[PDB]
Design a protein around this ligand. Structure first.
Ligand SMILES: [Zn+2]
Length: 182
C-alpha cells in the first residue's frame, strides 16, 4: 500500500517513448496479477487520459487525484472494503491500484456509472479485473462502448482513426478541469 494523492507541482514531466509505453503494458499486467494473488478480490486499475509523450503533468495529477477521491467514495457508498491501495507513476502517467472486497461484476457496473456520471469521468480509465485476471468490459453486459472524449462516436474508432488533434484533446482536459475547479 501507499498514499494515493500525487502532489501536482511535483509532476515529473517524464517523456515516454513508444517502446517504453509498449513495455509498460506487459509490466502493468504482471503487477496486476501480483495484486490479485496477494489479495484474491477484484482489482481496480486506474489511469487517466494522458495523450502525447508527457503523461505525468500537473493536469493529469489533478485529474487523477479527483478520481482517487471518487473511487474511495464509491467503495464506501457501495459498502465494499478496500483491502489495499496504492498510487505510482508509470509510463501511462499516474496509476492507481485498489484491491476491493466486492463482487467483480457489481464493481465494474459501479465504475461504469462513475465514468458516466462524474463531471471528470470522461477523463478516467477505470479497469476492473476479476481474481482470475479477466478484464471486464461494457460489452459483457451489452452496453454501448465508451464514447470518444471529443465526439459521439466510440473512443476506439476515433483512436484507431487518429481523428482528433493532440492539442484539442489536451485543451479539453484543461477545460473540464477548469469547469470543476473553478
Ligand atoms: Zn471522436
Amino acid at each position: 500500500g501507499s498514499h494515493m494523492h500525487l502532489l501536482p507541482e511535483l509532476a515529473s514531466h517524464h517523456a515516454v517513448s513508444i517502446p517504453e509505453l509498449l513495455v509498460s503494458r506487459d509490466e502493468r499486467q504482471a503487477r496486476q496479477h501480483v495484486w490479485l494473488k496477494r489479495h484474491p478480490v477484484p482489482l481496480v486499475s486506474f489511469t487517466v487520459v494522458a495523450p502525447g509523450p508527457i503523461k505525468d503533468s500537473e493536469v493529469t495529477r489533478r485529474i487523477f487525484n479527483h478520481g482517487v477521491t471518487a473511487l474511495r467514495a464509491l467503495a464506501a457508498k457501495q459498502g465494499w472494503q478496500i483491502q489495499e491501495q496504492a498510487a505510482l507513476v508509470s509510463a501511462s502517467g499516474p496509476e492507481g491500484m485498489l484491491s476491493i472486497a466486492a463482487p467483480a461484476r457489481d464493481l465494474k457496473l459501479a465504475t461504469i456509472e462513475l465514468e458516466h456520471s462524474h463531471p471528470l469521468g470522461r477523463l478516467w480509465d477505470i479497469d476492473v479485473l476479476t481474481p482470475e485476471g479477466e478484464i471486464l468490459s461494457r460489452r459483457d453486459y451489452s452496453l454501448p462502448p465508451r464514447r470518444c472524449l471529443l465526439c459521439e462516436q466510440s473512443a476506439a474508432v476515433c483512436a484507431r482513426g487518429k481523428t482528433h488533434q493532440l492539442t484539442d484533446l489536451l485543451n479539453r482536459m484543461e477545460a473540464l478541469l477548469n469547469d470543476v475547479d473553478a
